[PDB]
């Protein structure tokens, strides 16, 4: 998919449902299509426009989180995933994802241990959990 293909669709929306809210209601579509075009900076731009007018859509915060994760922007990805979980807490997968991202970025972060413990409740006996905990134990300070 090209930037031009997505532009054509945006133009069609402008021509038939031109109001500000109507256009914003199409921003998740625009963002996914730009993501398909591998236009990542534009995908971020447009998912942000949709979150503006549909702030409680957990799928939209998750998708914005995905874009930030692709940039290895740990803080922004975590914030987005956290909001998505708050809106739809059945997403246990995101709790593990947050823990994994924080551990990859900075073992020595109070945040990594906090999320790891939240994830451990949701994934009893998980070797993914046990591996992160090993990493945290390795970097613990000594009394």
UniProtKB/Swiss-Prot annotation:
Polyubiquitinated by PRKN, which leads to proteasomal degradation. The inner channel of the NPC has a different redox environment from the cytoplasm and allows the formation of interchain disulfide bonds between some nucleoporins, the significant increase of these linkages upon oxidative stress reduces the permeability of the NPC. TPR repeats lie at residues 24-57, 58-91, 92-126. Disulfide bonds: none annotated. It is found in: Nucleus; Nucleus membrane; Nucleus, Nuclear pore complex; Nucleus envelope. Coiled coil: none annotated. The modification Phosphothreonine is found at residue 17. The modification Phosphoserine is found at residue 19. Belongs to the RanBP2 E3 ligase family. Contains FG repeats. FG repeats are interaction sites for karyopherins (importins, exportins) and form probably an affinity gradient, guiding the transport proteins unidirectionally with their cargo through the NPC. FG repeat regions are highly flexible and lack ordered secondary structure. The overall conservation of FG repeats regarding exact sequence, spacing, and repeat unit length is limited. The PPIase cyclophilin-type domain has high structural similarity with PPIA, but has extremely low and barely detectable proline isomerase activity (in vitro). Only about half of the residues that surround the PPIA active site cleft are conserved. E3 SUMO-protein ligase which facilitates SUMO1 and SUMO2 conjugation by UBE2I. Involved in transport factor (Ran-GTP, karyopherin)-mediated protein import via the F-G repeat-containing domain which acts as a docking site for substrates. Binds single-stranded RNA (in vitro). May bind DNA. Component of the nuclear export pathway. Specific docking site for the nuclear export factor exportin-1. Inhibits EIF4E-dependent mRNA export. Sumoylates PML at 'Lys-490' which is essential for the proper assembly of PML-NB. Part of the nuclear pore complex. Forms a complex with NXT1, NXF1 and RANGAP1. Forms a tight complex with RANBP1 and UBE2I. Interacts with SUMO1 but not SUMO2. Interacts with PRKN. Interacts with sumoylated RANGAP1. Interacts with CDCA8. Interacts with PML (isoform PML-4). Interacts with BICD2. Interacts with MCM3AP isoform GANP. Interacts with COX11. Interacts with synaptic plasticity regulator PANTS. (Microbial infection) Interacts with HIV-1 Vpu protein; this interaction allows Vpu to down-regulate BLM sumoylation. It is linked to Encephalopathy, acute, infection-induced, 3: A rapidly progressive encephalopathy manifesting in susceptible individuals with seizures and coma. It can occur within days in otherwise healthy children after common viral infections such as influenza and parainfluenza, without evidence of viral infection of the brain or inflammatory cell infiltration. Brain T2-weighted magnetic resonance imaging reveals characteristic symmetric lesions present in the thalami, pons and brainstem. A chromosomal aberration involving RANBP2 is a cause of chromosome 8p11 myeloproliferative syndrome. Translocation t(2;8)(q12;p11) with FGFR1. Chromosome 8p11 myeloproliferative syndrome is characterized by myeloid hyperplasia, eosinophilia and T-cell or B-cell lymphoblastic lymphoma. In general it progresses to acute myeloid leukemia. This is E3 SUMO-protein ligase RanBP2. It comes from Homo sapiens. The chain holds residues 3 to 145 of 3224 of the full protein.
